[PDB]
Amino acid sequence: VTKFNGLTVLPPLLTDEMIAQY
Amino acid sequence: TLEILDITPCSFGGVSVITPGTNTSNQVAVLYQDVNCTEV
Numbered sequence: 470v471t472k473f474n475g476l477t478v479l480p481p482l483l484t485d486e487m488i489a490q491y
Numbered sequence: 492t493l494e495i496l497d498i499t500p501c502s503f504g505g506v507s508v509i510t511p512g513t514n515t516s517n518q519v520a521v522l523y524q525d526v527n528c529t530e531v
């Protein structure tokens with residue numbers, strides 16, 4: 470599975486490693 | 492001068508205020524979103 474005009478991409482709260490732990 | 496200059500926009504980001512309820516305390520912790528700590 471595969472700018473700077475005020476647009477932001479917030480990060481998820483559960484990182485992919487923590488999801489893998491779940 | 493025949494030289495090439497890249498232009499990067501000046502840093503910006505949202506400001507969030509992490510706060511326990513005013514009913515409990517009044518200290519706050521300010522999160523500056525997506526800015527390296529030096530730039531503040």
Ligand SMILES: *[C@@H]1O[C@H](CO)[C@@H](O[C@@H]2O[C@H](CO)[C@@H](O)[C@H](O)[C@H]2NC(C)=O)[C@H](O)[C@H]1NC(C)=O
Nearest residue numbers: 499501502503523524525526527528529530531
């Ligand atoms: C703040 O400074 C830079 C910019 O965000 C980061 O650390 C540098 O990252 C660059 C990669 O773009 C490296 O080439 C440098 O070697 C890194 N260190 C320095 C001192 O420039 C990081 O975000 C933050 N680093 C520090 C030390 O606060």
Ligand SMILES: *[C@@H]1O[C@H](CO[C@@H]2O[C@@H](C)[C@@H](O)[C@@H](O)[C@@H]2O)[C@@H](O)[C@H](O)[C@H]1NC(C)=O
Nearest residue numbers: 509510511512513514515516517518519520
């Ligand atoms: C809101 O707080 C009320 C009393 O708070 C008191 O004062 C603050 C500064 C703290 O020291 C706290 O520990 C004290 O109890 C109470 O009605 C209750 O704790 C809270 N009620 C609601 C609805 O949030």
